[PDB]
Design an enzyme around this catalytic site. Structure first.
Site, PDB file in Angstrom:
ATOM      1  N   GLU A 135       0.821  -1.209   0.000  1.00 35.84           N
ATOM      2  CA  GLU A 135       0.000   0.000   0.000  1.00 35.84           C
ATOM      3  C   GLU A 135       0.860   1.266   0.000  1.00 35.84           C
ATOM      4  O   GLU A 135       0.682   2.175   0.811  1.00 35.84           O
ATOM      5  CB  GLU A 135      -0.991  -0.025   1.163  1.00 35.84           C
ATOM      6  CG  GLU A 135      -1.915  -1.227   1.075  1.00 35.84           C
ATOM      7  CD  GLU A 135      -2.893  -1.333   2.215  1.00 35.84           C
ATOM      8  OE1 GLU A 135      -2.456  -1.425   3.393  1.00 35.84           O
ATOM      9  OE2 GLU A 135      -4.101  -1.257   1.943  1.00 35.84           O
ATOM     10  N   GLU A 146      -5.301  -8.403   0.981  1.00 37.52           N
ATOM     11  CA  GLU A 146      -6.060  -7.835   2.089  1.00 37.52           C
ATOM     12  C   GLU A 146      -7.483  -7.560   1.625  1.00 37.52           C
ATOM     13  O   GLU A 146      -7.681  -6.940   0.578  1.00 37.52           O
ATOM     14  CB  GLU A 146      -5.403  -6.514   2.517  1.00 37.52           C
ATOM     15  CG  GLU A 146      -6.146  -5.693   3.555  1.00 37.52           C
ATOM     16  CD  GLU A 146      -5.337  -4.491   4.023  1.00 37.52           C
ATOM     17  OE1 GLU A 146      -4.191  -4.311   3.546  1.00 37.52           O
ATOM     18  OE2 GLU A 146      -5.843  -3.728   4.872  1.00 37.52           O
TER      19      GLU A 146
END
Lengths: 475, 474
Positions: free
Chosen positions: B166, B374
């Protein structure tokens, strides 16, 4: 925002196609094309109109080029009629056929107009259809290559810009899915096989071009209607993903990357429709990188979710009666829907100049390729007023807004090489005669007679003349 | 007819080091930027921080035993750089490496594939002090030295590696929104740090091809697929801009080594484009990954935004619904509520079809296999007498997303696995513990660590059955 100017050598152009303009269908040794034969079947074309004479550009090319020079065209895109060069498709070269295109190219160059040669506009010689079904046989790869190489040999010294297959998605789908164009087949399995062979032929000729015209620029030209989702409902966005891939990436990914998109491939495989792949196919397709993507643009298409038992073939508007088309789609993937946020033509085509900016942005963003806009225009029932005046402000309005959006795409960073308005003169439509006119130059003929075939400059001719003179600064 | 999940499908669960480990100052571990940032008064809810978290550093054997009971095929975790190089670039800390060695051995002894994430936002504070961390090209070689250390110790036992997790979050939250370290609100600095992170990702992938030639590696992107609000051309154009600025800006660099041109030209016109050095493009282009990692929670809908329009917007920081406000780039796009999906009280869209769309877009654009690194639902859980946690809301969310993954696989997307967020409950960066994500409840709250005991939630057993049936029973 400061708009960027059009680049100094921007190719302000206009375009045509051989069957639609040339006439001289049986002169100087020309063989039959599939369209010579198909258009003579009773009921196929409106009022039996056909390309025997069309607008007689074969005999009138000097006057037409003189009008192009008066306009100041930087480029003229035309197609070469394969049946003039190889009357039987393969076999003996017809020198008189090559001599016509040589004379045309010389006339253009003598007036400072760049020729843009289009190898194929839907007119494969009938002899190849008779022998082996034309685009359904791998034999066409080498026959098309021999034809292209003949043109590269004779004209590569004088022609920098070349288009290979023009609107492959149209000639393949109309010829093999909808049965509207030659050979009049309605069989999706055959369609995708012919499409794969056409892909291989495109790659083969680009590979040959690198040998014979090393300083030239070549690419295919795709009939691109960018897809929009109807709204932000997830199922409608998914329908858009399916539509853009199935209708657009299916062709442009092969042209740019040599690969079919996987989701569309899997869908076809689930239907038993995927084409037959031979050893060496992927290597050939991947090695034939084009210099630009050609784009034929008229409109965007908006889509929404379509359930597995939903909409298939819809109703086309071929009359010019607004509001008469209906949704088309693929069950389980998407269906079209009227876009409430744009106007439409009388044939129900979206008028969406911003959509051209979007499509240009998408091609740059996905492929990083320069773009040649090979076709864009407005067709309408123009009237000839006394004094040989044609007031086509509607055409000026359409062209102006599209050119304005091209300039915004250039300002955004898209490399646009040129813009070819469809069309230079009025021309014969494939199935609908002459009344829906596209030219900057009106041709005095109709569906009933050739009249005197005289050329009459429309108001839009002078508008575009001023666009070119100012390099697009005055629109 | 739906295709089955492939037999090899990596049913996983995930965590991040700061959020789970604790042991913040043990065994020679140095300070991370998060150790320091979270102790600023008022920065985190009720002053919660990662000193203890859920104490996975000491409880990893029990946690892995629970993973084995569930039958996890894979467990994705991050390595804390400050445990391995306490000062970022000095002497290696063998006790820190030994913790990850013990963890990897425990996973392997239970037949669980480790998925090692190199970086989850916790650069050692010493590198921030020395040179500003991600704002200096010095971090490229320091990060590479750290990554190669892990490749050398663990490459024989770890096949799957994630590089930066991320990046778009740690860069934007740290340098545009000021929410995360280093607490900066400066777009020029954001794009400079982002470019350096891109180079660090590419350098370590190149190193990986040498040190772990049989492994698989990729970055993991926090992907919110953009939607146009409707078919108005200006809204579709806003979508093209938003998808390019928010998504292609990262994924095109990962996949192709190239920033998208329209976004680049816009930033250049604003004086915001990053500084390019000789060799940068060659490095970025030579570092193709084996997969794209995808962290997915929601889609975003956009519409046209006038030049006078919305710029930076307010993000929901309290869990009071409707307190986030629109954000965008004036003249290009702004966000707008999507009326066709529900949202949580933190204003996140619930859009499982959006996951299918995002998977389709990555396959369609990049032809890359995807590891979903995720995805999960954060919600309050009630601990009932007898240590029972019935989380049907979490099961419902996960079920719908797994169903859409199966549809993407049927469409032809190559999905390597799915890591639910999270295995146990964990510490959130700024919001404490009460919005829980785990299959395993951890008995603690924002005031007290209690006994940190692990309690399997109803969702633990649901996912156990998913794995047992390879996704046939959802």
């Amino acid at each position: 925002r400061h708009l960027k100017p059009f680049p100094p050598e921007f190719l302000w152009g206009a375009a045509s196609a051989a069957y639609q303009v040339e006439g001289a269908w049986n002169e100087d040794g020309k063989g039959l094309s599939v369209w010579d034969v198909f258009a003579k079947q009773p009921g196929r074309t409106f009022k039996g109109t056909n390309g025997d004479v069309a607008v007689d550009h074969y005999h009138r090319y000097q006057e037409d080029v003189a009008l192009m020079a008066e306009m100041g065209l930087k480029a003229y895109r035309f197609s070469v009629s394969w049946s003039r060069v190889f009357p039987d498709g393969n076999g003996a070269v017809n020198e008189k056929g090559l001599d016509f295109y040589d004379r045309l190219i010389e006339e253009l160059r003598n007036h400072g107009i760049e020729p843009i040669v289009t190898l194929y506009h839907w007119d494969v010689p009938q002899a190849l259809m008779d022998a082996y079904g034309a685009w359904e046989s791998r034999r066409i790869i080498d026959d098309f290559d021999r034809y292209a190489v003949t043109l590269f040999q004779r004209f590569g010294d004088r022609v920098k810009y070349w288009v290979t297959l023009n609107e492959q998605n149209i000639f393949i789908s109309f010829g093999y899915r909808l049965g509207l164009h030659p050979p009049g087949v309605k069989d999706m399995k055959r369609m995708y096989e012919a499409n794969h062979i056409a892909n291989l032929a495109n790659a083969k000729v680009i590979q040959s071009f690198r040998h014979y015209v090393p300083d030239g620029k070549i690419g295919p030209s795709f009939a691109y209607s960018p897809m929009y989702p109807y709204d932000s409902r997830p199922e409608n966005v998914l329908a858009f993903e399916n539509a853009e891939e199935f209708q657009n990436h299916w062709w442009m990914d092969v042209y740019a990357w040599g690969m079919y998109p996987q989701a569309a491939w899997n869908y076809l495989e689930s239907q038993g429709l995927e084409p037959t792949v031979a050893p060496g196919d992927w290597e050939l397709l991947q090695a034939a990188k084009p210099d630009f993507m050609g784009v034929n643009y008229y409109q965007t298409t908006t889509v929404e979710h379509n359930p597995p038992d939903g909409v298939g073939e819809g109703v086309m508007n071929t009359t010019g009666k607004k509001g008469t088309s209906t949704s088309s789609g693929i069950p389980g993937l998407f269906k079209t829907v009227r876009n409430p946020h744009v106007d439409t033509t009388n044939w129900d085509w979206a008028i969406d100049p911003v959509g051209l900016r979007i499509g240009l942005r998408r091609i740059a963003n996905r492929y990083q390729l320069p773009i040649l806009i090979t076709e864009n225009g407005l067709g309408e029932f123009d009237t000839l007023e006394p004094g040989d005046i044609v007031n086509d402000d509607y055409r000026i309005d359409y062209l102006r807004r599209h050119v304005q959006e091209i300039q915004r795409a250039i300002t955004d960073g898209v490399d646009v090489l040129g813009y070819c308005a469809w069309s230079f003169t009025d021309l014969l439509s494939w199935l609908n005669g002459y009344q829906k006119r596209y030219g900057f130059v009106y041709v005095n003929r109709d569906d009933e007679s050739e009249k005197d075939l005289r050329r009459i400059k429309k108001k839009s001719f002078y508008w575009y003349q001023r666009v070119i003179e100012t390099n697009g600064a005055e629109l």
